Write a protein that binds this DNA or RNA. Sequence first.
RNA 1: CGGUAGGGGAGCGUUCCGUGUUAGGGAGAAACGCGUGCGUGAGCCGCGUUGGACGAAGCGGAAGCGAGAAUGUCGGCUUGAGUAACGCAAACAUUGGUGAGAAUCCAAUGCCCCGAAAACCUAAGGGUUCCUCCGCAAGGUUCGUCCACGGAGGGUGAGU
RNA 2: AGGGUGAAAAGAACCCCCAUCGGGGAGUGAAAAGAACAUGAAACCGUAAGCUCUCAAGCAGUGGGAGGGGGACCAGACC
Lengths: 203, 48, 172, 170, 116, 119
Amino acid sequence: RKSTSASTKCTEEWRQLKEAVKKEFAIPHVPLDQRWMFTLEEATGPDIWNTTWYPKSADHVPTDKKWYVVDATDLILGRMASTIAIHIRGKNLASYTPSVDMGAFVIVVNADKVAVSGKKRTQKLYRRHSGRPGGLKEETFDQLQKRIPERIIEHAVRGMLPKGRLGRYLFNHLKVYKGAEHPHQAQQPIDLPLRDKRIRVEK
Amino acid sequence: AVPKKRTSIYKKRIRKNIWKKKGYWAALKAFSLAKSLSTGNSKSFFVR
Amino acid sequence: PEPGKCDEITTRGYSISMSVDKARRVIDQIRGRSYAETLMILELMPYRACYPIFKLIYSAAANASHNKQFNKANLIISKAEVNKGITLKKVKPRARGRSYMIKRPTCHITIVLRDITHFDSYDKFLESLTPKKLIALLGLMSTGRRRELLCGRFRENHKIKSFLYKIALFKR
Amino acid sequence: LKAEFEEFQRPPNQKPQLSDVLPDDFQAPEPGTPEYNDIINQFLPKKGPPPPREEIFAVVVIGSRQYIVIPGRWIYTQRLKGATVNDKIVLNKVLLVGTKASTYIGTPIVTNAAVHAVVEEQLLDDKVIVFKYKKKKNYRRNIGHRQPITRIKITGITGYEDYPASTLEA
Amino acid sequence: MKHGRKIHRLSRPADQRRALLRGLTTQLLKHGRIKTTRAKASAMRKYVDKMITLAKEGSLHKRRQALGFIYEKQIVHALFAEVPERYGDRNGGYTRIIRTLPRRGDNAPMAYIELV
Amino acid sequence: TRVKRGYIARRRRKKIRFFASSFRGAHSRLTRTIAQQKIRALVSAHRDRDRQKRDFRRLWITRINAAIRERGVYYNYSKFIHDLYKRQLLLNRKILAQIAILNPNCIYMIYNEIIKKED
RNA sequence: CGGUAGGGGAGCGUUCCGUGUUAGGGAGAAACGCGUGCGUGAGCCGCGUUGGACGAAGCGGAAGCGAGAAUGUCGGCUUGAGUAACGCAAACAUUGGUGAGAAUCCAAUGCCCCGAAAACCUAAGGGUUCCUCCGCAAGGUUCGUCCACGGAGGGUGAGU
RNA sequence: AGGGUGAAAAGAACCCCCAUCGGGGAGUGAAAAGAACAUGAAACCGUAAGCUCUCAAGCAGUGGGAGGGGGACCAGACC
Ligand SMILES: [Mg+2]
Ligand SMILES: [Mg+2]
Ligand SMILES: [Mg+2]
Ligand SMILES: [Mg+2]
Ligand SMILES: [Mg+2]
Ligand SMILES: [Mg+2]
Ligand SMILES: [Mg+2]
Ligand SMILES: [Mg+2]
Ligand SMILES: [Mg+2]
Ligand SMILES: [Mg+2]
Ligand SMILES: [Mg+2]
Ligand SMILES: [Mg+2]
Ligand SMILES: [Mg+2]
Ligand SMILES: [Mg+2]
Ligand SMILES: [Mg+2]
Ligand SMILES: [Mg+2]
Ligand SMILES: [Mg+2]
Ligand SMILES: [Mg+2]
Ligand SMILES: [Mg+2]
Ligand SMILES: [Mg+2]
Ligand SMILES: [Mg+2]
Ligand SMILES: [Mg+2]
Ligand SMILES: [Mg+2]
Ligand SMILES: [Mg+2]
Ligand SMILES: [Mg+2]
Ligand SMILES: [Mg+2]
Ligand SMILES: [Mg+2]
Ligand SMILES: [Mg+2]
Ligand SMILES: [Mg+2]
Ligand SMILES: [Mg+2]
Ligand SMILES: [Mg+2]
Ligand SMILES: [Mg+2]
Ligand SMILES: [Mg+2]
Ligand SMILES: [Mg+2]
Ligand SMILES: [Mg+2]
Ligand SMILES: [Mg+2]
Ligand SMILES: [Mg+2]
Ligand SMILES: [Mg+2]
Ligand SMILES: [Mg+2]
Ligand SMILES: [Mg+2]
Ligand SMILES: [Mg+2]
Ligand SMILES: [Mg+2]
Ligand SMILES: [Mg+2]
Ligand SMILES: [Mg+2]
Ligand SMILES: [Mg+2]
Ligand SMILES: [Mg+2]
Ligand SMILES: [Mg+2]
Ligand SMILES: [Mg+2]
Ligand SMILES: [Mg+2]
Ligand SMILES: [Mg+2]
């Protein structure tokens, strides 16, 4: 129950006072888009030119980030998964930082048309282990792709993401769908740039 | 079997707090009981 | 000066024959409770410790009545703590010539009863004012009346303390 | 005297009343009045406007490190040998001069460019503990190091104008 | 386990628990109301009612069966006098159990079992 | 002349303990442990004042790489750097990384100079 | 100008003595607590809403002179843990009573156990534990109004 | 094995909680130093206030520092 007693009233009011005064004297945030060397305000601030730039909270905020779509049809699994990893991680932004999430979201569609070279369709082996003895299980790539094909690309990208807290939190940014349709149209996905030559296979 | 190590301060504080929480449930029973004898309507209960 | 002078009665029991852990189990429940509730609870609790703690709290309430002139209705148990007392050791024989040590733990208990109503004038009056209104009202009075107004529990309860030292509303 | 009065009244009479410390004389100044806004300006000041500086920055080499310098600001460097407090030095190694209308890019140096600075202080750095240690070889050595440091203030960036500028001109 | 084992053990072996119950009921019939542990009370119900229902019939047979339960004769005769008077209309359910504050020594839950 | 050790011990200890403020658990309490913990602290510190110099170069180089790769399809860190040198510019990697984030248009200009001359 | 065994050089500190019944010190010494202070470090210098009477610097001297390790050692306090146990499987129950407070102290009524003892008496031993009144800090494996416990006051009589 | 209340027992009348012990006032005293009493470190036991932990793998630190808080006078710093 939210008490409207004069006490809690008073406290909230006061806290917006503290927040107001803290906001007025604080140095403004200037986003990085054609952001020129300095604003006459930062110039009074700390030294951000002679130290390495590290991102502040206003930057990485989740709501901003790019979205991308990869049509995975006739793509080669690994070569695409490397690209995906790069973008999810943020390694292609000038603002990249190892300790922060600067990356994008990536939407993979048509995850059952992904292509793999040579005999791998029947040879490559996805193993997972119960944790009891004799508890080993194995699938060929193809059994998997008929049963739950998204897991193939998830399992290939998760390999190339960092491991550990940031790794996992990153892994949630990869959205995979088996059909040719994704329900993300609201996020306005851009297409993914692919600079690799060998990534597109032709039969 | 013995304790290969000595139990760290903080973990011990957590276990003893668990044992102190039973006091919380006891204080609830006690309160409810007091409010029941504080009306003098109970025929199942008796005090002298 | 400080709120501790106005609101507070402190009472120490010394050398109660409860061990500190047992006694703590009861004291944790009565921390922050109206003196009334704490009374009835401590009458009906199962524990042994409850009886000495009871005698103690009853006492401290009497002290706040007869010494510093407070209303019993408005007493809460604001701060209560148990600290270890003097431990008496005794040696007993075990099996096969070994001995062992028994400790007979005592404790000190400190109950600090605190009036709610005392300060209520300044309390509710300062609640009455919006944050700007209050700073406008404090623009008149000398350093003296500022210090006298704001020397209630007010600055703590709403967590203004470091803000008002920043608004230059005070001297330290 | 209102402090002595209200304290002797909160001393003698226990349970203090609001009418005694704040008399019924003061209504407070109306929330829209000038006598309200002088106080609320005193105690809650609005952020003042930023001081003017030139829109320009340079990249200069000192003690074989490269700093970005904007005028009016002070930086830390290596001790400059034979520099005294209140000295006007000129930094002649200038790689880059930016302006929001222009950017001058030296090959390697911007010719004739000079950065006028004044040496405001001569310091010793925060003491770094250099600590040499080898396990089980029973050898540890504890040694502090304080680096001498020169703290200087950039005043102006000058004599670039003649050099060829480039621009992103779309 | 126990499924459907309905007996009250009272944490005594069979012999002692029998003797206990005999005792407690001669006390209840002699004084008319007593203070015990909730367990002992709840257990004692059945045997109280056995004695009462016994004395409602009054035959030398029944009376001999009561004499061989209760410890003191005097109480038995008193029963076979009083009961047809006091309980004649009550079809079963002759005891009240009114619980109280727990015991100080062990914190054993107490109770007051009354002959109603 | 008997000499108790007196305070000479506890001063040393206390001055050590001051170091170890904010160590979790018994690294902030027991003196004997605190000692070790102090040494290790000082040690890692020394180590990483050296790692530091490696690491920021790591970083800067990475950021530069990203900043350039935006422009040409075929363009790299390596290619870039090589061109900075055969053009005789002195800007080191801290500066190009900072100008990459803080003044991106500038880095575009630099690239346009390097291209024009390599043309 | 890496460094173990190991050798050499340069220092810091502790208590005491000389200078000295020094400078300084209830206008707060030693000590204790703190430091945006200074040292290559051992440490120094400064500061105190602690503390309550001593005692620097300099230039010298002397050692019971520096600790983290000795299954060292003496005290203190933890962990195990509110866990194991509470010393026979003769068995207790209720009503009164005393009392601030009773599962445990007193009385009554039942019930149960020993009875070639778990009865009564005497040797040895112990040494006042015996009795009355008072007490409930410690002892009593819980409790305690009680006690072989504590405090006072008593008590042992021989020609056989 | 067990030393140091104060200069002096002036060792706390009286009231309150109150079966005693123990305490809170008043009074004594330069100070309560209150009899378990002089300086009173550490372990260890807590209480309050600031920030913070319940998808996490770790000799617990260190270099980088998001966000939040605090005492400043070289407010770009410190904690
Ligand atoms: Mg033996
Ligand atoms: Mg043992
Ligand atoms: Mg060795
Ligand atoms: Mg049992
Ligand atoms: Mg039998
Ligand atoms: Mg039997
Ligand atoms: Mg039946
Ligand atoms: Mg000596
Ligand atoms: Mg020694
Ligand atoms: Mg830290
Ligand atoms: Mg060497
Ligand atoms: Mg050597
Ligand atoms: Mg000295
Ligand atoms: Mg000295
Ligand atoms: Mg000396
Ligand atoms: Mg003199
Ligand atoms: Mg001093
Ligand atoms: Mg001395
Ligand atoms: Mg010194
Ligand atoms: Mg010296
Ligand atoms: Mg003196
Ligand atoms: Mg001297
Ligand atoms: Mg010696
Ligand atoms: Mg030792
Ligand atoms: Mg020991
Ligand atoms: Mg323990
Ligand atoms: Mg266990
Ligand atoms: Mg168990
Ligand atoms: Mg058990
Ligand atoms: Mg045993
Ligand atoms: Mg026994
Ligand atoms: Mg028999
Ligand atoms: Mg006998
Ligand atoms: Mg006898
Ligand atoms: Mg004899
Ligand atoms: Mg004796
Ligand atoms: Mg006797
Ligand atoms: Mg006792
Ligand atoms: Mg006892
Ligand atoms: Mg009595
Ligand atoms: Mg006696
Ligand atoms: Mg007194
Ligand atoms: Mg009594
Ligand atoms: Mg008393
Ligand atoms: Mg007084
Ligand atoms: Mg006086
Ligand atoms: Mg002391
Ligand atoms: Mg997970
Ligand atoms: Mg989390
Ligand atoms: Mg973790």
